[PDB]
Amino acid sequence: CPLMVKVLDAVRGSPAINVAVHVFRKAADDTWEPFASGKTSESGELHGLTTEEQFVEGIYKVEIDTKSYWKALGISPFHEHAEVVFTANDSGPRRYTIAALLSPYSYSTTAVVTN
Amino acid sequence: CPLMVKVLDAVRGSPAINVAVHVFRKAADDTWEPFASGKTSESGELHGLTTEEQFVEGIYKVEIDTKSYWKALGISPFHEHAEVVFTANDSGPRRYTIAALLSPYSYSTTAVVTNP
Amino acid sequence: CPLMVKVLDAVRGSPAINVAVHVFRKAADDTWEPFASGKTSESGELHGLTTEEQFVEGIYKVEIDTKSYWKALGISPFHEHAEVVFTANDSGPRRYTIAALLSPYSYSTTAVVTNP
Amino acid sequence: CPLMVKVLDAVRGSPAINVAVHVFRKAADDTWEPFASGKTSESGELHGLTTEEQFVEGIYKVEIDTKSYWKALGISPFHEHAEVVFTANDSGPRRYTIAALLSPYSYSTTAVVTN
Numbered sequence: 001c002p003l004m005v006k007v008l009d010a011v012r013g014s015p016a017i018n019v020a021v022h023v024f025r026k027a028a029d030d031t032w033e034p035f036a037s038g039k040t041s042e043s044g045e046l047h048g049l050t051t052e053e054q055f056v057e058g059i060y061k062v063e064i065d066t067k068s069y070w071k072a073l074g075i076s077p078f079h080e081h082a083e084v085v086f087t088a089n090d091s092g093p094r095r096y097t098i099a100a101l102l103s104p105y106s107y108s109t110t111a112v113v114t115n
Numbered sequence: 116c117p118l119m120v121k122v123l124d125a126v127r128g129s130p131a132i133n134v135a136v137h138v139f140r141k142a143a144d145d146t147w148e149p150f151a152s153g154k155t156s157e158s159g160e161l162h163g164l165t166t167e168e169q170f171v172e173g174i175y176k177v178e179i180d181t182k183s184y185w186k187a188l189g190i191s192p193f194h195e196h197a198e199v200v201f202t203a204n205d206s207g208p209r210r211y212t213i214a215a216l217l218s219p220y221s222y223s224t225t226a227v228v229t230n231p
Numbered sequence: 232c233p234l235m236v237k238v239l240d241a242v243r244g245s246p247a248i249n250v251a252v253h254v255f256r257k258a259a260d261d262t263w264e265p266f267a268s269g270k271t272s273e274s275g276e277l278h279g280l281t282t283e284e285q286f287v288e289g290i291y292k293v294e295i296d297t298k299s300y301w302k303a304l305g306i307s308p309f310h311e312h313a314e315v316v317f318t319a320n321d322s323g324p325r326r327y328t329i330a331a332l333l334s335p336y337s338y339s340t341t342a343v344v345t346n347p
Numbered sequence: 348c349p350l351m352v353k354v355l356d357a358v359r360g361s362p363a364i365n366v367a368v369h370v371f372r373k374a375a376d377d378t379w380e381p382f383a384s385g386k387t388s389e390s391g392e393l394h395g396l397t398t399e400e401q402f403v404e405g406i407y408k409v410e411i412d413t414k415s416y417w418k419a420l421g422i423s424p425f426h427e428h429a430e431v432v433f434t435a436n437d438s439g440p441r442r443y444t445i446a447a448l449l450s451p452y453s454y455s456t457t458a459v460v461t462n
């Protein structure tokens with residue numbers, strides 16, 4: 001996996017399961033081309049989004065459907081979703097873990113980018 | 116002031132100063148209409164974006180140009196910007212403070228929402 | 232005011248009010264000497280803990296009673312408290328704001344340190 | 348592993364490697380009995396701290412030596428260390444992941460507690 005997403009729940013202290021994730025690549029359009037999507041697993045992880053071959057350098061957006069997550073739990077959320085937009089390179093490290101820690105009125109997001 | 120943005124720098128333990136912020140409102144179509152913009156002051160705060168009258172119910176997006184901020188310090192950060200998207204005033208007028216704490220490869224963001 | 236504490240609630244998008252805070256200073260031995268205490272106001276802020284004169288160089292510990300806070304809301308949180316331990320004034324007097332954002336199983340904490 | 352520690356670096360976007368971690372249990376003394384310790388691995392993880400048998404219910408403290416970490420990197424830090432103090436139970440879920448995301452003037456910490 002050149003790209004994976006991991007989502008944590010700060011209210012329950014658990015992985016955030018069954019969270020919808022959409023990934024997009026910016027076109028020469030400056031519009032957002034759908035690129036990959038999935039639901040987080042029982043461990044709050046989404047793997048298998050793309051391959052090294054297709055994950056070329058460019059700007060990518062990862063959209064995490066946080067509002068549907070909290071609504072399904074019966075908790076009132078603030079944000080429509082959590083978006084992470086970043087340039088994916090070739091020069092440096094190649095595997096990207098985008099992590100998000102979720103609360104109803106806050107979220108933190110980080111990237112772990114390794115060889 | 117119904118919409119304020121506060122930005123902190125987690126590397127230096129300081130306000131994040133001169134950070135560009137653009138605000139947008141979603142129309143009955145789904146494109147983002149420009150709504151307000153400004154840049155953070157010496158205290159890392161941006162005020163005076165809007166008024167109670169103008170700040171009606173809707174979906175808003177607050178985009179904070181974190182990349183130019185880090186690049187000005189010589190750092191190539193992970194994110195292009197930090198965007199915060201939320202429904203506002205759907206149960207009546209409220210005051211919203213949108214706060215972001217920034218690191219080169221991470222940021223956290225929280226909202227304080229109060230009823231005046 | 233050289234030492235202020237600000238506490239936010241990430242579940243409700245609000246200041247964390249009536250949160251107990253105890254501050255301690257480490258002695259030339261390694262036990263923690265009580266230094267100041269208070270509880271956060273309606274805005275989630277606690278001021279007036281100390282003065283420039285009294286707040287000399289040393290290692291300080293700010294302990295925020297997050298567990299009583301959550302328990303008062305019916306929640307059994309993960310942490311017993313959140314403790315923030317830091318050297319202060321080692322290069323001259325500064326003003327320190329210690330901020331904590333709280334969730335039942337998580338918290339973040341940051342310091343804004345300024346030179347008056 | 349009933350207990351593990353995972354530490355992330357928010358400045359470099361990597362695991363925090365070679366971070367010293369000390370764990371303590373509160374005695375009837377209200378003093379802090381050393382319980383386990385270790386350095387984080389290349390993946391920012393510390394495993395093998397204890398066993399289900401010895402990890403009985405009680406209050407535990409996890410101390411992460413964040414200042415030594417930043418000093419070794421030549422970056423000025425604010426905190427002496429990051430401490431996490433929590434009660435470890437029997438009633439509910441049994442495996443504890445204590446995660447910390449580190450910046451020089453901030454840190455976030457969460458627990459993922461599962462069966």
Ligand SMILES: O=C(O)c1ccccc1Nc1cc(Cl)cc(Cl)c1
Nearest residue numbers: 099101108109110446448455456457
């Ligand atoms: O917990 C993990 O497994 C994890 C892995 C990669 C990045 C972050 C991770 N947790 C995490 C912990 C905090 Cl305190 C904040 C964020 Cl954003 C992620």
Ligand SMILES: O=C(O)c1ccccc1Nc1cc(Cl)cc(Cl)c1
Nearest residue numbers: 214216223224225330332339340341
């Ligand atoms: O909100 C404030 O006024 C504030 C002031 C100083 C430091 C932090 C502050 N908020 C804050 C915002 C995030 Cl996203 C995380 C944390 Cl720990 C504090």
Ligand code: NA
Nearest residue numbers: 082083197198
């Ligand atoms: Na975002």
Ligand code: NA
Nearest residue numbers: 313314429430
């Ligand atoms: Na702590």
